[PDB]
């Protein structure tokens with residue numbers, strides 16, 4: 001596994017820019033401000049289902065102060081250990097320069113993901129993903145001058161055959177040859193895709209993996225909705241089948257723990273992670289120290305039992321919420337729209353039947369009646385193409401809210417037929 | 418005035434990526450914030466009302482918020498900025514550079530997003546060495562030609578800036594193929610590592626040249642509130658009649674380094690490329706941490722903020738007082754150095770040793786003493802450096818006494 005092909009000229013040229021022997025030791029060498037100057041002295045944070053979190057005066061100075069680039073070591077060790085327990089990556093005991101598994105706490109998981117595109121993509125590069133695809137990722141990949149090659153997805157995500165067919169534009173030996181512009185990577189959201197809410201299967205993941213071996217590209221696994229799986233048996237990740245070190249997982253605490261706190265993490269091979277760490281060192285520097293410590297203490301006080309149980313209560317909430325969105329649709333959309341039932345996440349994806357563009361429907365008529373939901377146009381490389389799709393958030397609304405929401409939508413559709 | 422020549426093809430192709438009511442909305446992407454474990458917060462402040470988050474606030478604090486900062490924090494920094502600098506640009510048309518500001522994840526987030534926005538490989542850029550190693554290492558992979566401007570007690574020597582530019586004519590600004598300097602990067606207030614600051618006369622002159630030659634000025638000003646002189650030298654932003662100043666500001670030295678929260682002020686179209694890059698990277702600065710800071714600032718008020726920064730300049734001033742005292746004591750005739758004008762560093766040039774790397778990395782450590790060799794603060798970091806960076810931020814008068822006596826001892830052993 002050669003990593004140089006996946007590291008921009010710029011990315012390779014980064015050197016480490018850190019904040020960075022007898023016994024007592026009198027350092028004037030370092031850069032830290034004096035943390036006594038800072039105004040906040042203590043904190044108490046109450047937790048549902050938990051012991052309150054205390055920052056004593058000493059701990060608060062630590063929270064107000066520069067901390068390491070890759071994250072605090074107690075959160076780093078605990079997430080690594082989570083990743084060993086959840087996924088047991090084939091690579092954890094490999095050599096560093098082969099793909100030893102490494103992890104970086106990042107300022108939300110999209111920070112890591114961006115820095116990963118920037119690391120990989122030369123203009124003119126080819127990338128695989130399936131559409132509909134995440135708004136945020138299209139606005140991300142677009143300025144990078146890559147050519148986005150769409151793989152068909154259905155209710156089970158990426159269709160493997162589509163991937164085969166697409167990749168038969170190249171011989172496998174073309175991977176050893178940059179001129180041939182073989183794909184760099186496949187970007188997938190494998191659990192409750194935003195916007196579609198469909199998830200990848202196990203058999204499918206294994207097959208995708210083999211194609212990724214054969215055509216020696218990286219798999220980018222964006223898995224923000226992995227702890228929002230409604231099925232009890234969690235589907236194995238690409239991470240857990242990564243005997244090569246061709247997988248970069250992104251994990252988020254945003255749907256589960258806190259979206260505000262901007263704390264997520266990036267799991268992958270050392271040399272790749274290292275490029276992101278080094279990019280972080282000249283931009284954000286680290287994730288907020290305060291907030292890492294809220295999460296780290298929270299998580300260590302729960303242990304893995306409290307964490308998983310918490311995630312079981314989130315899932316429980318999000319499913320009933322999903323039962324209610326579907327009831328409501330089964331109630332009003334029947335025979336007027338088509339949808340599959342979300343495998344994870346917080347989004348229902350609704351194909352309205354016999355209307356071409358739902359933008360008018362939504363942005364003109366539906367808003368006038370006081371109901372709103374997201375036109376599907378944004379979720380395609382070509383956002384100007386007509387979409388007959390709505391994305392509907394089942395995250396906040398009460399059963400009655402959805403009832404009126406779908407009573408009104410169905411009316412506007414009937415009125416627009 | 419023409420910002421397109423200042424913005425990369427990439428930076429430019431970026432697209433923004435974020436009601437009668439009683440409205441029902443189903444197209445939000447917010448997660449249900451009620452699922453979050455953290456319920457209430459209390460934080461204490463020395464000489465301040467206790468900051469409290471009730472269940473509602475807290476919820477907002479654990480939730481996605483705007484890209485460029487919560488609005489009660491943006492207006493307060495936007496205000497502070499009108500008040501500290503009163504930019505001639507405030508009431509400009511937006512497309513003509515109207516002063517804009519986003520909260521960033523610490524000031525170096527903004528400043529990185531700004532190099533990425535500006536720099537094509539091959540471009541020519543100005544700053545003054547020694548320069549902060551971080552900025553060196555940020556710029557290095559961007560593939561610019563770094564052109565060193567001479568500096569002295571007082572920062573960037575502008576005569577040197579004139580002689581450098583004389584290789585072009587003003588007219589070469591409108592001709593991209595001439596490769597005129599894209600921008601001048603500076604740390605106007607005790608530069609890290611020198612601790613030197615620009616004078617107001619020099620800043621004027623620097624501005625004229627930047628006008629003549631149409632280059633941006635990035636004023637990296639993390640030590641703005643750490644100024645030992647009670648009159649604060651006017652900033653490049655207070656004299657940006659053109660819309661060519663990009664200012665970085667930091668709460669890292671005064672408020673918190675750890676909360677990662679700083680701010681970038683500058684022409685709207687330029688800030689706009691930065692906010693759009695933030696939207697697919699960090700999304701925004703921690704909502705929680707902005708709320709902590711915001712409620713601290715509104716409660717202190719403009720006055721009270723300032724009483725604080727005085728409080729810490731006073732602290733930093735005594736520390737550097739203590740550090741100069743000890744240098745005087747042990748280092749006289751063995752070294753030379755200027756009084757830092759601001760910041761937390763002292764920059765000491767040791768006599769008759771060509772490179773200080775052995776002196777520190779072998780001898781000093783062994784004797785339990787540490788200072789930072791200058792090597793790292795120049796483009797060419799393999800070059801001998803007879804200079805030491807020393808931090809007066811934490812050490813006590815006693816620990817500085819022993820640091821220096823020990824350091825002078827070994828300097829005299831190495832002669």
Ligand SMILES: O=C(O)CCC(=O)C(=O)O
Pocket residue numbers: 435446447448481482700
């Ligand atoms: O529009 C926003 O503020 C945030 C959207 C987001 O990150 C999400 O898709 O969950």
